[PDB]
């Protein structure tokens, strides 16, 4: 019965109840994603740290998936600036980083994803792999369909993201897969103050 | 406003899992096919999705789509007209295309997505926008992390997908954000029988 | 809605699902209770430690409420003998001891109590206060009513328990509140080998 | 044997909480009264429980019991015959005594117990066996830990309870397992108006 | 609360135990009762002595009757049973069965009924070392011998070193203060020699 | 995919922008277009120069037309508006509004339509320091002056130090290699004196 569907449905539920209950009081927040593999002496990591700090300076909780690399970097920045640093972890066949103040673990991928969208009001993507891209395209869809509103999307690293963005222009816009505004609405930058200000300005007057 | 609050959200989520697990319980082996909703029937990508549907049914697979128009309908048409099993898992936003034999409509994005991974053993991406991309990188990340196994990923459209693949293959691999096998494992092709035999072979002996 | 009954019922459920799921694989076990206030240099604590070790030597997991004092003592004994030491903690207006290997935290008192009874097959009470006595009388009731069977109850500390046992004889038996066997079935001892053997012997042939 | 397995246990537990929260939703202020089920109507303890029921209703309380015979029936009779609100929360093991105006039957011990703490603001213990003792030390421990507040505890029967109180007061206090106020706070008396006024006073100004 | 927990039923239960005991033991052949500590284990010298005693009693054609429990009650039951003699156990029901060497077992709720059966259906008492349960039967038989309620009822203590201090106190204090007469104590044999014990019994029963 | 994303609709949209622009600006009084970097902030000396330029242009009875964005487009709009002159902004629609000092604003999707409106409805160009958008308009007006498609159309660069290296290259390299004639470059004024700039324009427009 443990692996059968009746228990499963109950377990799924149980995980949604737990998540919603533990995050119910969350203040305004930004979710930051990026590669788990990048090390602490890398420029992207330094930026992630600086991004953490500046978001807290703008009164935002920082939410990440709680792993190492470019999840750690923004948690570290936020925590050491004495803001609220949240890590929403996932059980993988593959542990929360030491800079997560409010740590949650999720068994179900789909429950954890829902949390990011329900308890933050913008996404910033530092450079990453498939996990980062999975989140980026999900939120681009949610914005495009109106399931979330006033939800800024920012990409950090111009060198890094250029190829993807060019392809989405050069091919998806050109072929009518998306509207121009679906890609245009994203900010792509190397400037963290402008990244934060872009978020503040889109959230001004709620 | 109980209708927008958590207790009701939880019951609705449960209701959706239950309805999908019940309806999909008996599913034989299957392939999920993704692609842009906006492409019309006289387009070559559409004609290709009809023929893919047909060949998948000739290989004894059920064909699963998101249930909408365009390149979700094409494979449902192919599969349907070949007298195999055609499935559409819609999202509430419009109705299921008229070539769905087994239809379900989901309100929750994340619930629908789960059902693709649970009730099919391969993903084929026809050209598409952000909804297709979102599904592609979700599966790439499930394969990468071992959460699914023997789960082939095919992209149809060499010209369309080239530039994405080139960015992945050069940005992500070179910066060390994925391993080279993580991208090489997927098939990129315009040859539909080669796509099907790719899938068959990866499922050999189950 | 958070403090209202619909969410509450869902939360209650969620906690039962989580507990049953995490303890489902438990091997045979004994629950040990006792005072949280007793210190590590006290005779009762030494006995609790020795009790831990001997239960593991008889192939039993040791389950406690995970707090300090005479919960810690049996966890320590069991853990340092490389057996399975379980701590089932409770959120109080009042943290698991360092010798808990499998630690769970419960919001609901009634869910945590159910766990002790469902995932152990005997109770041993070291000397304690009201929390210990609450558990002792609950299990005495469950045995008396047949809700659990082959469930040995042992009290440790002859000097300590004498007054209570004498009163339950001198008054509850004499007045017909309970049958003689309801108190007689308990072993009261200072001898830990005999405490363990009493449990082994009552569990022999399942 | 789905009927003894966890999925069904969970649904049954939920069903029981829901049914109790629904039926008890509107409860005015109340006292729970405990005592042995085996004492008959011509006994003085029974006569005392009838008069206690009556006086509780004269003080504008509903009277809550476990719903069975003996010293659970006596207060239901007193309360009932004085035209106040008489409640019985039975346990499945037999039926509710005939003086219950508002009856519910529970299969789960732990669910029933919760409802006493949630839907009454004082416990009175007539002489009883292990079921009474179990409830008494549960409330003692809730009061001690701050989980309930302004929650008076009265024991009726000075002769009957003396020896328990003397053991507590000397063993537990002297060995440092409880503080002296933890036992002094309860009232032990044969005077029923003194018992009621004890409760009224502890609830003064709500 | 219950009829069962009140004097009318208690009197019926009492009667029941006398009846069942008198009925089951009525036909007993000649017999010795052996008492001693329930706590001693099978590897202790006393245990081994108890086994040999049961064996020798049966070679003298006696049934061997005990309290039917463990330790130095089981030992003489073992001895007797394994020599193909009659081994009897009259147990007392206690919180937390008869030992496996008892071949005619009865079980008593009432200590006082059980104690009557030892005096009525055996004709000698032998006390291996023991505690308060043993000392209880000893002083009862001694008072039954002194009052004449039993006649020709030899009493033997085994373990000279174990018993010496009790027997010295009884002589130096009870005799000297006139609480007993000297023959009330001189008539017990105290010895370590089991053949002498059994011979004391045989000889005491002979010429009757 | 959409009618909207195809050439028939594009041609209609193009026509629409010319029509709306020709319609709205048809009545314009005499005007100068000012260009310069969108990136400079309001505390920079160039910004302050831009404000003063707008003020002085309006005192010479010119409307002041800009690209309607921030930085050194907003500065002359501010100058002009706050002197009670006509301040015009012809914006280009870009990912991520007209500046708040624009009092006659239009917004263009098509860069090429917008660039036509600057040439058709102003009679002088002044370029504050700027980047590639600025240099683009400069070399277009210069080519329109050299080809005779506009006449009596003065061109002024502000910031002698900023512009010197461009103007030196144009003389030492384009003239010397015969790519332009020397008057094609000598006819621009380069200066830091805003009254001289405005006087160069006035004088160039006089006696016509
Ligand atoms: Cl798509
Ligand atoms: Cl193709
Ligand atoms: Cl009771
Ligand atoms: Cl009383
Ligand atoms: Cl003894
Ligand atoms: Cl000896
Ligand atoms: Cl001798
Ligand atoms: Cl520019
Ligand atoms: Cl200047
Ligand atoms: Cl000058």
PDB file of C-alpha atoms in Angstrom, chain D:
ATOM      1  CA  UNK D   1      -7.297  -6.248   4.366  1.00  0.00           C
ATOM      2  CA  UNK D   2      -7.548  -2.623   3.517  1.00  0.00           C
ATOM      3  CA  UNK D   3      -9.602  -2.129   6.606  1.00  0.00           C
ATOM      4  CA  UNK D   4      -6.744  -2.394   9.019  1.00  0.00           C
ATOM      5  CA  UNK D   5      -4.223  -0.498   6.940  1.00  0.00           C
ATOM      6  CA  UNK D   6      -3.026   3.038   7.127  1.00  0.00           C
ATOM      7  CA  UNK D   7      -4.905   4.693   4.293  1.00  0.00           C
ATOM      8  CA  UNK D   8      -8.182   3.733   5.833  1.00  0.00           C
ATOM      9  CA  UNK D   9      -6.976   4.499   9.361  1.00  0.00           C
ATOM     10  CA  UNK D  10      -6.152   8.056   8.211  1.00  0.00           C
ATOM     11  CA  UNK D  11      -9.514   8.626   6.524  1.00  0.00           C
ATOM     12  CA  UNK D  12     -11.288   7.214   9.687  1.00  0.00           C
ATOM     13  CA  UNK D  13      -9.277   9.514  11.934  1.00  0.00           C
ATOM     14  CA  UNK D  14     -10.154  12.478   9.786  1.00  0.00           C
ATOM     15  CA  UNK D  15     -13.822  11.381   9.753  1.00  0.00           C
ATOM     16  CA  UNK D  16     -13.783  11.396  13.582  1.00  0.00           C
ATOM     17  CA  UNK D  17     -12.209  14.760  13.999  1.00  0.00           C
ATOM     18  CA  UNK D  18     -14.576  16.254  11.476  1.00  0.00           C
ATOM     19  CA  UNK D  19     -17.657  14.745  13.196  1.00  0.00           C
ATOM     20  CA  UNK D  20     -16.552  15.958  16.628  1.00  0.00           C
ATOM     21  CA  UNK D  21     -15.552  19.479  15.508  1.00  0.00           C
ATOM     22  CA  UNK D  22     -18.882  19.749  13.720  1.00  0.00           C
ATOM     23  CA  UNK D  23     -21.075  18.578  16.592  1.00  0.00           C
ATOM     24  CA  UNK D  24     -19.151  20.484  19.287  1.00  0.00           C
ATOM     25  CA  UNK D  25     -18.656  23.674  17.357  1.00  0.00           C
ATOM     26  CA  UNK D  26     -21.161  25.674  19.303  1.00  0.00           C
ATOM     27  CA  UNK D  27     -20.348  24.408  22.802  1.00  0.00           C
ATOM     28  CA  UNK D  28     -20.850  26.897  25.570  1.00  0.00           C
ATOM     29  CA  UNK D  29     -18.545  26.779  28.571  1.00  0.00           C
ATOM     30  CA  UNK D  30     -18.135  23.301  30.025  1.00  0.00           C
ATOM     31  CA  UNK D  31     -16.686  20.996  32.571  1.00  0.00           C
ATOM     32  CA  UNK D  32     -15.562  17.437  31.870  1.00  0.00           C
ATOM     33  CA  UNK D  33     -16.316  14.932  34.600  1.00  0.00           C
ATOM     34  CA  UNK D  34     -14.517  11.608  34.857  1.00  0.00           C
ATOM     35  CA  UNK D  35     -15.044   8.565  37.111  1.00  0.00           C
ATOM     36  CA  UNK D  36     -15.227   4.753  37.191  1.00  0.00           C
ATOM     37  CA  UNK D  37     -17.776   3.165  34.866  1.00  0.00           C
ATOM     38  CA  UNK D  38     -18.347   0.274  37.372  1.00  0.00           C
ATOM     39  CA  UNK D  39     -19.891   2.153  40.330  1.00  0.00           C
ATOM     40  CA  UNK D  40     -23.689   1.709  40.681  1.00  0.00           C
ATOM     41  CA  UNK D  41     -26.396   4.214  41.422  1.00  0.00           C
ATOM     42  CA  UNK D  42     -26.860   3.520  45.134  1.00  0.00           C
ATOM     43  CA  UNK D  43     -23.166   4.193  45.838  1.00  0.00           C
ATOM     44  CA  UNK D  44     -22.273   7.472  47.526  1.00  0.00           C
ATOM     45  CA  UNK D  45     -19.792   8.366  44.729  1.00  0.00           C
ATOM     46  CA  UNK D  46     -22.704   8.058  42.326  1.00  0.00           C
ATOM     47  CA  UNK D  47     -24.938  10.230  44.426  1.00  0.00           C
ATOM     48  CA  UNK D  48     -22.129  12.753  44.632  1.00  0.00           C
ATOM     49  CA  UNK D  49     -21.777  12.798  40.775  1.00  0.00           C
ATOM     50  CA  UNK D  50     -25.512  13.434  40.345  1.00  0.00           C
ATOM     51  CA  UNK D  51     -25.293  16.429  42.675  1.00  0.00           C
ATOM     52  CA  UNK D  52     -22.122  17.670  40.998  1.00  0.00           C
ATOM     53  CA  UNK D  53     -23.909  17.560  37.630  1.00  0.00           C
ATOM     54  CA  UNK D  54     -26.753  19.593  39.101  1.00  0.00           C
ATOM     55  CA  UNK D  55     -24.486  22.208  40.618  1.00  0.00           C
ATOM     56  CA  UNK D  56     -22.475  22.585  37.446  1.00  0.00           C
ATOM     57  CA  UNK D  57     -25.602  23.365  35.488  1.00  0.00           C
ATOM     58  CA  UNK D  58     -26.703  25.842  38.226  1.00  0.00           C
ATOM     59  CA  UNK D  59     -23.327  27.527  37.603  1.00  0.00           C
ATOM     60  CA  UNK D  60     -24.225  27.708  33.862  1.00  0.00           C
ATOM     61  CA  UNK D  61     -21.780  24.976  32.657  1.00  0.00           C
ATOM     62  CA  UNK D  62     -22.469  22.140  30.279  1.00  0.00           C
ATOM     63  CA  UNK D  63     -21.407  18.783  31.739  1.00  0.00           C
ATOM     64  CA  UNK D  64     -19.239  16.537  29.509  1.00  0.00           C
ATOM     65  CA  UNK D  65     -18.521  12.896  30.171  1.00  0.00           C
ATOM     66  CA  UNK D  66     -17.253   9.765  28.467  1.00  0.00           C
ATOM     67  CA  UNK D  67     -20.923   8.790  27.968  1.00  0.00           C
ATOM     68  CA  UNK D  68     -20.831   5.367  29.653  1.00  0.00           C
ATOM     69  CA  UNK D  69     -22.410   3.956  32.802  1.00  0.00           C
ATOM     70  CA  UNK D  70     -21.558   4.477  36.470  1.00  0.00           C
ATOM     71  CA  UNK D  71     -19.799   7.654  37.391  1.00  0.00           C
ATOM     72  CA  UNK D  72     -20.078   8.897  33.804  1.00  0.00           C
ATOM     73  CA  UNK D  73     -23.816   8.496  33.891  1.00  0.00           C
ATOM     74  CA  UNK D  74     -24.288  10.169  37.366  1.00  0.00           C
ATOM     75  CA  UNK D  75     -23.220  13.575  36.281  1.00  0.00           C
ATOM     76  CA  UNK D  76     -25.094  13.317  32.953  1.00  0.00           C
ATOM     77  CA  UNK D  77     -28.240  12.488  35.080  1.00  0.00           C
ATOM     78  CA  UNK D  78     -27.681  15.449  37.403  1.00  0.00           C
ATOM     79  CA  UNK D  79     -27.121  17.814  34.493  1.00  0.00           C
ATOM     80  CA  UNK D  80     -29.929  16.375  32.442  1.00  0.00           C
ATOM     81  CA  UNK D  81     -32.486  16.445  35.248  1.00  0.00           C
ATOM     82  CA  UNK D  82     -31.584  20.034  36.015  1.00  0.00           C
ATOM     83  CA  UNK D  83     -32.381  20.889  32.374  1.00  0.00           C
ATOM     84  CA  UNK D  84     -28.921  21.935  31.405  1.00  0.00           C
ATOM     85  CA  UNK D  85     -26.790  20.597  28.593  1.00  0.00           C
ATOM     86  CA  UNK D  86     -25.548  17.041  29.052  1.00  0.00           C
ATOM     87  CA  UNK D  87     -22.805  15.658  26.743  1.00  0.00           C
ATOM     88  CA  UNK D  88     -21.473  12.171  26.265  1.00  0.00           C
ATOM     89  CA  UNK D  89     -18.439  11.380  24.127  1.00  0.00           C
ATOM     90  CA  UNK D  90     -18.401   7.568  24.011  1.00  0.00           C
ATOM     91  CA  UNK D  91     -15.714   5.155  22.965  1.00  0.00           C
ATOM     92  CA  UNK D  92     -16.339   2.066  20.862  1.00  0.00           C
ATOM     93  CA  UNK D  93     -15.565  -1.107  22.679  1.00  0.00           C
ATOM     94  CA  UNK D  94     -22.194  -0.921  24.553  1.00  0.00           C
ATOM     95  CA  UNK D  95     -23.954   2.456  24.129  1.00  0.00           C
ATOM     96  CA  UNK D  96     -24.308   5.968  25.575  1.00  0.00           C
ATOM     97  CA  UNK D  97     -26.116   6.225  28.911  1.00  0.00           C
ATOM     98  CA  UNK D  98     -29.719   7.425  28.702  1.00  0.00           C
ATOM     99  CA  UNK D  99     -29.022  10.887  30.197  1.00  0.00           C
ATOM    100  CA  UNK D 100     -26.875  12.190  27.273  1.00  0.00           C
ATOM    101  CA  UNK D 101     -28.573  15.023  25.290  1.00  0.00           C
ATOM    102  CA  UNK D 102     -25.646  15.425  22.865  1.00  0.00           C
ATOM    103  CA  UNK D 103     -23.954  12.095  22.133  1.00  0.00           C
ATOM    104  CA  UNK D 104     -21.027  11.079  19.887  1.00  0.00           C
ATOM    105  CA  UNK D 105     -19.221   7.760  19.624  1.00  0.00           C
ATOM    106  CA  UNK D 106     -15.517   7.565  18.811  1.00  0.00           C
ATOM    107  CA  UNK D 107     -13.461   4.586  17.690  1.00  0.00           C
ATOM    108  CA  UNK D 108     -10.148   6.285  18.343  1.00  0.00           C
ATOM    109  CA  UNK D 109      -9.192   6.770  21.927  1.00  0.00           C
ATOM    110  CA  UNK D 110      -6.874   9.647  21.115  1.00  0.00           C
ATOM    111  CA  UNK D 111      -9.435  11.545  19.135  1.00  0.00           C
ATOM    112  CA  UNK D 112     -11.978  11.371  21.972  1.00  0.00           C
ATOM    113  CA  UNK D 113      -9.415  12.604  24.486  1.00  0.00           C
ATOM    114  CA  UNK D 114      -8.584  15.636  22.421  1.00  0.00           C
ATOM    115  CA  UNK D 115     -12.161  16.678  22.345  1.00  0.00           C
ATOM    116  CA  UNK D 116     -12.267  16.805  26.208  1.00  0.00           C
ATOM    117  CA  UNK D 117      -9.371  19.261  26.313  1.00  0.00           C
ATOM    118  CA  UNK D 118     -10.707  21.300  23.368  1.00  0.00           C
ATOM    119  CA  UNK D 119     -14.337  21.642  24.332  1.00  0.00           C
ATOM    120  CA  UNK D 120     -14.180  22.012  28.124  1.00  0.00           C
ATOM    121  CA  UNK D 121     -12.295  24.372  30.470  1.00  0.00           C
ATOM    122  CA  UNK D 122     -11.998  22.264  33.665  1.00  0.00           C
ATOM    123  CA  UNK D 123     -11.712  18.595  34.648  1.00  0.00           C
ATOM    124  CA  UNK D 124     -13.350  17.068  37.690  1.00  0.00           C
ATOM    125  CA  UNK D 125     -12.243  13.505  38.709  1.00  0.00           C
ATOM    126  CA  UNK D 126     -14.626  11.390  40.725  1.00  0.00           C
ATOM    127  CA  UNK D 127     -13.037   8.202  41.917  1.00  0.00           C
ATOM    128  CA  UNK D 128     -11.972   6.005  39.021  1.00  0.00           C
ATOM    129  CA  UNK D 129      -9.599   3.502  37.539  1.00  0.00           C
ATOM    130  CA  UNK D 130      -6.981   3.789  34.852  1.00  0.00           C
ATOM    131  CA  UNK D 131      -9.080   5.675  32.336  1.00  0.00           C
ATOM    132  CA  UNK D 132      -9.686   8.407  34.946  1.00  0.00           C
ATOM    133  CA  UNK D 133      -6.065   8.430  36.019  1.00  0.00           C
ATOM    134  CA  UNK D 134      -4.936   8.690  32.395  1.00  0.00           C
ATOM    135  CA  UNK D 135      -7.049  11.813  31.892  1.00  0.00           C
ATOM    136  CA  UNK D 136      -5.928  13.360  35.160  1.00  0.00           C
ATOM    137  CA  UNK D 137      -2.214  13.137  34.395  1.00  0.00           C
ATOM    138  CA  UNK D 138      -2.758  14.333  30.787  1.00  0.00           C
ATOM    139  CA  UNK D 139      -4.385  17.518  32.122  1.00  0.00           C
ATOM    140  CA  UNK D 140      -1.772  17.919  34.894  1.00  0.00           C
ATOM    141  CA  UNK D 141       0.895  17.796  32.153  1.00  0.00           C
ATOM    142  CA  UNK D 142      -0.960  20.241  29.841  1.00  0.00           C
ATOM    143  CA  UNK D 143      -1.285  22.687  32.702  1.00  0.00           C
ATOM    144  CA  UNK D 144       2.323  22.202  33.693  1.00  0.00           C
ATOM    145  CA  UNK D 145       3.621  22.871  30.174  1.00  0.00           C
ATOM    146  CA  UNK D 146       1.377  25.864  29.461  1.00  0.00           C
ATOM    147  CA  UNK D 147      -0.562  24.163  26.693  1.00  0.00           C
ATOM    148  CA  UNK D 148      -3.751  24.993  28.484  1.00  0.00           C
ATOM    149  CA  UNK D 149      -4.349  27.880  30.792  1.00  0.00           C
ATOM    150  CA  UNK D 150      -7.004  28.788  33.453  1.00  0.00           C
ATOM    151  CA  UNK D 151      -7.890  25.092  33.460  1.00  0.00           C
ATOM    152  CA  UNK D 152      -8.919  23.964  36.923  1.00  0.00           C
ATOM    153  CA  UNK D 153      -8.467  20.342  38.115  1.00  0.00           C
ATOM    154  CA  UNK D 154     -10.568  18.994  40.970  1.00  0.00           C
ATOM    155  CA  UNK D 155     -10.494  15.566  42.626  1.00  0.00           C
ATOM    156  CA  UNK D 156     -13.662  14.529  44.452  1.00  0.00           C
ATOM    157  CA  UNK D 157     -13.093  12.069  47.286  1.00  0.00           C
ATOM    158  CA  UNK D 158     -10.591  13.029  49.967  1.00  0.00           C
ATOM    159  CA  UNK D 159     -10.267   9.501  51.304  1.00  0.00           C
ATOM    160  CA  UNK D 160     -10.045   7.855  47.926  1.00  0.00           C
ATOM    161  CA  UNK D 161      -7.443  10.216  46.419  1.00  0.00           C
ATOM    162  CA  UNK D 162      -5.357  10.877  49.560  1.00  0.00           C
ATOM    163  CA  UNK D 163      -2.760   8.260  49.003  1.00  0.00           C
ATOM    164  CA  UNK D 164      -2.093   9.260  45.357  1.00  0.00           C
ATOM    165  CA  UNK D 165      -1.713  12.815  46.359  1.00  0.00           C
ATOM    166  CA  UNK D 166       0.626  11.871  49.224  1.00  0.00           C
ATOM    167  CA  UNK D 167       2.878   9.831  46.834  1.00  0.00           C
ATOM    168  CA  UNK D 168       2.962  12.671  44.297  1.00  0.00           C
ATOM    169  CA  UNK D 169       3.544  15.197  46.939  1.00  0.00           C
ATOM    170  CA  UNK D 170       6.422  13.298  48.492  1.00  0.00           C
ATOM    171  CA  UNK D 171       8.004  11.067  45.864  1.00  0.00           C
ATOM    172  CA  UNK D 172       7.652  13.322  42.813  1.00  0.00           C
ATOM    173  CA  UNK D 173       8.215  16.667  44.542  1.00  0.00           C
ATOM    174  CA  UNK D 174      11.152  15.372  46.656  1.00  0.00           C
ATOM    175  CA  UNK D 175      12.890  13.718  43.796  1.00  0.00           C
ATOM    176  CA  UNK D 176      12.456  16.911  41.854  1.00  0.00           C
ATOM    177  CA  UNK D 177      10.245  15.564  39.149  1.00  0.00           C
ATOM    178  CA  UNK D 178       7.620  18.194  39.571  1.00  0.00           C
ATOM    179  CA  UNK D 179       7.436  21.524  41.354  1.00  0.00           C
ATOM    180  CA  UNK D 180       5.271  21.737  44.467  1.00  0.00           C
ATOM    181  CA  UNK D 181       2.775  24.137  42.755  1.00  0.00           C
ATOM    182  CA  UNK D 182       2.149  21.527  40.174  1.00  0.00           C
ATOM    183  CA  UNK D 183       0.352  19.431  42.718  1.00  0.00           C
ATOM    184  CA  UNK D 184      -0.940  22.116  45.057  1.00  0.00           C
ATOM    185  CA  UNK D 185      -2.889  23.700  42.253  1.00  0.00           C
ATOM    186  CA  UNK D 186      -5.431  20.982  42.223  1.00  0.00           C
ATOM    187  CA  UNK D 187      -8.328  20.894  44.540  1.00  0.00           C
ATOM    188  CA  UNK D 188      -9.038  17.739  46.560  1.00  0.00           C
ATOM    189  CA  UNK D 189     -12.359  17.919  48.324  1.00  0.00           C
ATOM    190  CA  UNK D 190     -15.667  16.298  49.258  1.00  0.00           C
ATOM    191  CA  UNK D 191     -17.501  19.603  49.186  1.00  0.00           C
ATOM    192  CA  UNK D 192     -19.211  20.013  45.804  1.00  0.00           C
ATOM    193  CA  UNK D 193     -20.095  23.671  46.121  1.00  0.00           C
ATOM    194  CA  UNK D 194     -16.474  24.344  47.052  1.00  0.00           C
ATOM    195  CA  UNK D 195     -15.503  22.417  43.833  1.00  0.00           C
ATOM    196  CA  UNK D 196     -17.767  24.471  41.649  1.00  0.00           C
ATOM    197  CA  UNK D 197     -16.711  27.767  43.208  1.00  0.00           C
ATOM    198  CA  UNK D 198     -13.074  26.684  42.692  1.00  0.00           C
ATOM    199  CA  UNK D 199     -13.858  26.368  38.985  1.00  0.00           C
ATOM    200  CA  UNK D 200     -15.886  29.531  38.750  1.00  0.00           C
ATOM    201  CA  UNK D 201     -13.176  31.514  40.400  1.00  0.00           C
ATOM    202  CA  UNK D 202     -10.461  30.162  38.144  1.00  0.00           C
ATOM    203  CA  UNK D 203     -12.609  31.225  35.133  1.00  0.00           C
ATOM    204  CA  UNK D 204     -13.374  34.719  36.584  1.00  0.00           C
ATOM    205  CA  UNK D 205     -13.623  37.386  33.856  1.00  0.00           C
ATOM    206  CA  UNK D 206     -12.977  34.526  31.353  1.00  0.00           C
TER     207      UNK D 206
END
